Design a protein around this ligand. Sequence first.
Ligand SMILES: *[C@@H]1O[C@H](CO)[C@@H](O[C@@H]2O[C@H](CO)[C@@H](O[C@@H]3O[C@H](CO[C@H]4O[C@H](CO)[C@@H](O)[C@H](O)[C@@H]4O)[C@@H](O)[C@H](O)[C@@H]3O)[C@H](O)[C@H]2NC(C)=O)[C@H](O)[C@H]1NC(C)=O
Ligand SMILES: *[C@@H]1O[C@H](CO)[C@@H](O[C@@H]2O[C@H](CO)[C@@H](O)[C@H](O)[C@H]2NC(C)=O)[C@H](O)[C@H]1NC(C)=O
Ligand SMILES: *[C@@H]1O[C@H](CO)[C@@H](O)[C@H](O)[C@H]1NC(C)=O
Ligand SMILES: *[C@@H]1O[C@H](CO)[C@@H](O)[C@H](O)[C@H]1NC(C)=O
Ligand SMILES: *[C@@H]1O[C@H](CO)[C@@H](O)[C@H](O)[C@H]1NC(C)=O
Ligand SMILES: *[C@@H]1O[C@H](CO)[C@@H](O)[C@H](O)[C@H]1NC(C)=O
Ligand SMILES: *[C@@H]1O[C@H](CO)[C@@H](O)[C@H](O)[C@H]1NC(C)=O
Lengths: 318, 318, 319, 171, 169, 169
Amino acid sequence: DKICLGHHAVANGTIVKTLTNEQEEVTNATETVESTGINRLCMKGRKHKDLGNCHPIGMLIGTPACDLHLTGMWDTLIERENAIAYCYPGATVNVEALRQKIMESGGINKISTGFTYGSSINSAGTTRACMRNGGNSFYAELKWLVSKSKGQNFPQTTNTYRNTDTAEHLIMWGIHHPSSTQEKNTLYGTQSLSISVGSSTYRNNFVPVVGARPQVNGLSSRIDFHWTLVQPGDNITFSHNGGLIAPSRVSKLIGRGLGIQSDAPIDNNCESKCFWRGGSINTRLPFQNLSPRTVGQCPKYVNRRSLMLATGMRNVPE
Amino acid sequence: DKICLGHHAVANGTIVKTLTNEQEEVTNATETVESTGINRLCMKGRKHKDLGNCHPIGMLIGTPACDLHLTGMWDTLIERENAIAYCYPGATVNVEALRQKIMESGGINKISTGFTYGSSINSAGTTRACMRNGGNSFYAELKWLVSKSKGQNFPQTTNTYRNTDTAEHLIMWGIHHPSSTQEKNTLYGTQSLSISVGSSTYRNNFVPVVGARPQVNGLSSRIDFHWTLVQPGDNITFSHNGGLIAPSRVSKLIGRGLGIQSDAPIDNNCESKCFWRGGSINTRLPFQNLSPRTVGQCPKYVNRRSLMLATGMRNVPE
Amino acid sequence: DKICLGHHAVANGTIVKTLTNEQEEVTNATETVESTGINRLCMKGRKHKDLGNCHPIGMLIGTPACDLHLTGMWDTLIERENAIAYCYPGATVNVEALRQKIMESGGINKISTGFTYGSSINSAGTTRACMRNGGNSFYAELKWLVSKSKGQNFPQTTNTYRNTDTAEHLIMWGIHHPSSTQEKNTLYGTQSLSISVGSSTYRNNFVPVVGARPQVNGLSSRIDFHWTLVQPGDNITFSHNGGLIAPSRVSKLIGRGLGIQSDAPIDNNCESKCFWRGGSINTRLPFQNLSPRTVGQCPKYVNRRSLMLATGMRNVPEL
Amino acid sequence: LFGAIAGFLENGWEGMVDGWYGFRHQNAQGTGQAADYKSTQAAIDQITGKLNRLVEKTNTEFESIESEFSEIEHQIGNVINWTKDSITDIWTYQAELLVAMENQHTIDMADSEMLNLYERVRKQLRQNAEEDGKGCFEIYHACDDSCMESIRNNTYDHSQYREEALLNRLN
Amino acid sequence: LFGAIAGFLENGWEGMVDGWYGFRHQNAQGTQAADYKSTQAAIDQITGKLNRLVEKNTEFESIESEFSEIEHQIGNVINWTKDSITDIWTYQAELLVAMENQHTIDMADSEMLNLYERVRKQLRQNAEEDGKGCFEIYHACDDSCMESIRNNTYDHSQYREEALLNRLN
Amino acid sequence: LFGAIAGFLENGWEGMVDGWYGFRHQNAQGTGQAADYKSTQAAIDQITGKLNRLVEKTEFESIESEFSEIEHQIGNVINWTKDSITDIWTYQAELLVAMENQHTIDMADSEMLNLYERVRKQLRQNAEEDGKGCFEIYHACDDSCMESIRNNTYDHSQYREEALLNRLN
Ligand SMILES: *[C@@H]1O[C@H](CO)[C@@H](O[C@@H]2O[C@H](CO)[C@@H](O[C@@H]3O[C@H](CO[C@H]4O[C@H](CO)[C@@H](O)[C@H](O)[C@@H]4O)[C@@H](O)[C@H](O)[C@@H]3O)[C@H](O)[C@H]2NC(C)=O)[C@H](O)[C@H]1NC(C)=O
Ligand SMILES: *[C@@H]1O[C@H](CO)[C@@H](O[C@@H]2O[C@H](CO)[C@@H](O)[C@H](O)[C@H]2NC(C)=O)[C@H](O)[C@H]1NC(C)=O
Ligand SMILES: *[C@@H]1O[C@H](CO)[C@@H](O)[C@H](O)[C@H]1NC(C)=O
Ligand SMILES: *[C@@H]1O[C@H](CO)[C@@H](O)[C@H](O)[C@H]1NC(C)=O
Ligand SMILES: *[C@@H]1O[C@H](CO)[C@@H](O)[C@H](O)[C@H]1NC(C)=O
Ligand SMILES: *[C@@H]1O[C@H](CO)[C@@H](O)[C@H](O)[C@H]1NC(C)=O
Ligand SMILES: *[C@@H]1O[C@H](CO)[C@@H](O)[C@H](O)[C@H]1NC(C)=O
């Protein structure tokens, strides 16, 4: 008469790592590193905006590509690889800082500057480089100011925008840089050009400079874009001679949102809190090996294919 | 006839987490996360400077609010909310880097630049915007240089500061941006204005940005500030034409100290090594959840209310 | 009759820390923090370049100090303390960005710009501040353009560099800042000076500015250097009328390399994957306490002299 | 380590698919097998306790500091690279240690639950059985199917069989 | 887990304020004393852990202004870094107590079992285990004898013949 | 902890030089000592598993110039980040060694106890524990017999009848 104590075993067992052994066999184990991701931006439950080929900067200045994204509300903002910011070629100062501010916002309202110009000014410059409805056009939120009489000196002008709102406003403008002496003369006159801009928190001077350059979108001219934040109650003033690309509206960034740069198409029928370039990560696991670049609420990135956590005893086969 | 082994238990036991059990009851436990901090700045054993409504930048430039803080020694420097840096409209270029230097320092000495000006220069000008006692004053460490004869060209002028010491000196200066072409011509003449500033390491040039006609708009009289370090044995020269707000003294940051931004009342009776916006943390514990923003020798911030460490066995009551 | 069980023990045990006891004697233990490094740069297995007194920036513009370092291939680049970048005194905009790009690289090729100037420009200007063979010279990759007729207006000029390659090129130029009106007028004339530079992806413009300054290598004037990357297939154009220090060659950074700043002598007979200001670290250990600033594949730095890992049982000697 | 699993117990029983630990008996009317539910649930519960902690993580919201589609300034780019790689080195190391540590514990915990079952039966059998060293208990009295069961139940009263058992043991 | 606390010992003793581990009585005259050495062993190991916990630090300065604006891009890098560090420390702190606590509990279990074991081996062939943590002693064991068992001075061979014949009869 | 090393065994054997664990015996032929190879290997193999883990092994580049000025704000961020990374590693390094050492010690303890348990069960009713790690054997056990104990081939049935008689008289 015997009675014997024992444990179970399984025919085929899993190998895991311990402190004292790299090849320990156990009855069972699960993964702790996530390896599979969704190939979709899972936007269900999110007021998301997919920008398409509109670059965030273009929403502020009103590049044609961004006509559907001039104002709106969102809690998630998606930027795409092919995104266009400039139709009229140029560049923006502190552009990455401006992009990040836009990509952290929860929306944009637009507000008129109310700028008006005397009769010696043509405030409606257009160009082939900015087609809007099959016709020559220009940045929606800016006005290209040139002399109404082709070779004459652009008049000394002053324009002031008053932020009468309770939140700060973001105002942008441009400085035209002609590609020839003749072009400068026809647009603004032979006079020396000077453009200065000021608020309680900003003071600066700009001078259009002629220079030969490669054509971009057909033009050898450029615009330098600048921006600043006009505080509540504060006044910003433009004093100018020709060359100013003037704001017709200003921007107000509202609330907060999650910015995402991605390749993946949107799925509005699935939910996620973690995003990367290739889509979404939905997992309960603490670690992931898909990408070191994620935004949102994510498992930590680790340099490991697999990390098995034992869920059973040592497997001791018969 | 027996002998029985056992262990103690307690009427009311404490709950802790283990690898395998949230809610494990133990006879005793102590907290590892400090959740209460002292609401004062504990300054016992620290030679310290409470700056009050003096902003660190105002120390170098000599704003009226900072008159009692133009020099000193300290191992701790305390900055307060809404401290005044400027009395005249304008701002400092590269201000956070400079504020951090001041707030890392162990004291300040001032050294006269020795600058002297010809008879065609008036350097005693003052302004309503910087009141001192009941009268028009100016930044104490600077001088506003204007043409003695109103409307005439401010003379081509050279001033040189020589650092003859064994440590680096911090020199600040200002640039006047007049409110209009008429104010500019009054103060400095009709000539084009240039301020160049050059040492062995540093070169830079400045042109006053003249504003435009209504005084309440964004383009009016302001003074913006600039700074650099002059190394031992190096000289720094100002060549200027009108528009320079020239230093009458330079600064020497001395030693090292701990900088604190807080609105908490100083308490000279208790000691501390860790500070935050609410005043102080005095704990032996390794973690705290009071604030993610602390300076000093601090417990690490964690996003948890409580982490109890068992100090006894499982509690097993009858 | 009896049989007794037991465990070994040793005369001299060593102390380790445990979770519950910081003075636990054990039979044996082993170190986990490395505390000694080699005080040489161990370069065996590496095609390396020691810049000596040549600063990385000077490789791009051709300071005399860098004449033996204008082109090359390397997987390891070594910068020395006090290396010289500039002969003609000046500074570079975003210098540290540029210094790191070079220190990340695995070589530099030089490609000529082919710039030519008309009969009114002197391209061969030299100075007492840059010497070769003990005589006046200038940066090897740049050219100081002045008026051939002293005091007369430098002609409005255009020069264009075309990147016909498959890789981005790094172009550097200078802007001259004279020390007096008199000097400025002699070199470039009385006219207003303007220099604009433009690619498909870069636009900037510059004005020479006159001003009294201390003498550095005997000169009160300065050169500000500027740089940009020119993409393959793109052209960059210089429009100028006095003040441009013009590039005669552009640079191509090639591949990837490890940059090291150290003044430790080089040793070609030992190898290493970890470096710091004074030497190399060869160790199997996961932690080190030599330096918080290391470069390469390195053990993690820890603020401790010693962490003994037990490699045996409690030592229980007979009492 | 506790000495039973991969220890004095030769191997596991692939045929016990009803629990982690159990009994095999041999008496007059044949042999039997039966899993012990308490001990297996102790072990399973402790495992699921670890799995809960593994998934009981909850997340800070991070935003982007690296452009996926545009050049970042070179120096801030290098700082961000150094920081991100340093963070990752820490996590890779935390994940490796976590799992190595947790697995060691899990294995020894299971060994411990085996040993505690074994020890309870021993004390239960008192002076009526002897250990064979390979995990069995040789019972020195007639132990019927309903006796065996009393051993698994914890019903077994040793004093009921003590006289008989001591007799056969001493002879 | 060792066998004893929350195991074959049904429960703890609230009346034992004398120490963590101990003995209870039964003889003619008979009825509790705490064991000093095993209690100390336990407490000592707890205070070792407390010593490591309060072990303390690098000096940190401020890298974000409480009272003014920081540049947007460097501000974001600083935000990302700090939250990353915090996620690490939060994880470490939770791991630290969970793991330390597991070990404290088992360590304590361990000290209980070692005392029990020492008494077992002491009693040799004069006692039998009841499975609830008791030793039923087969000879008369008065207060002085019981003290010799706690005091680790009990001599089994002095009682052994009396004990054996009571055990076997 | 397991109760043997620094426990019910009074001290280690300095003169046991080719094993971590072993046997000392006493019989008519005199005394002797022998190491047990398997238990010492199980202890040793586990240590070298830890050492293997410790020496397993990202390329990093410079982000602060040894030899030139670094901008002040970015420099403070770098100093703050680098110090925060060093605090994490310093903590981890100390926690690693502390945890590892605890476990190595306790592991060694248990390999001693398991050897001790293997021999107990093998001696069955033919020996008795004296509480200090010795088994008092109640029959003659010559050098050949001792080796069968160390061998794990000792057959208790061959001496049982005699052993029981000697334990009771
Ligand atoms: C970068 O610089 C390049 C060189 O200037 C630019 O390519 C140049 O662009 C111009 C105008 O767009 C082209 O000019 C025309 O050339 C034809 C004759 O072409 C044939 O002969 C030339 C000369 O031997 C040969 O190189 C060509 O491959 C053709 O076989 C004339 O009939 C026209 O009147 C006019 O002069 C240049 O040909 C072209 N050069 C090259 C090498 O392509 C380029 O556009 C600049 N890039 C940017 C982005 O601006
Ligand atoms: C700072 O200025 C002083 C004079 O302006 C320079 O010093 C003179 O230096 C020369 C060269 O050694 C000596 O011959 C003179 O005796 C010095 N004069 C005095 C009164 O010091 C000095 O070289 C300048 N420093 C720099 C770096 O330019
Ligand atoms: C294997 O482990 C997983 C993870 O807990 C669990 O779902 C499953 O039941 C285990 N399977 C086996 C073989 O028991
Ligand atoms: C802005 O302009 C309005 C209207 O002139 C005026 O009330 C206000 O004082 C100005 N703001 C400032 C700060 O000057
Ligand atoms: C930063 O590191 C990533 C990883 O390899 C790489 O894509 C990128 O080019 C590096 N960026 C910089 C600043 O050179
Ligand atoms: C950084 O985060 C803080 C805290 O949430 C916030 O107030 C500030 O806006 C953020 N900075 C940036 C760059 O968004
Ligand atoms: C950074 O810290 C180091 C090392 O203590 C120091 O020498 C240097 O001053 C510090 N940099 C800044 C920005 O303070």
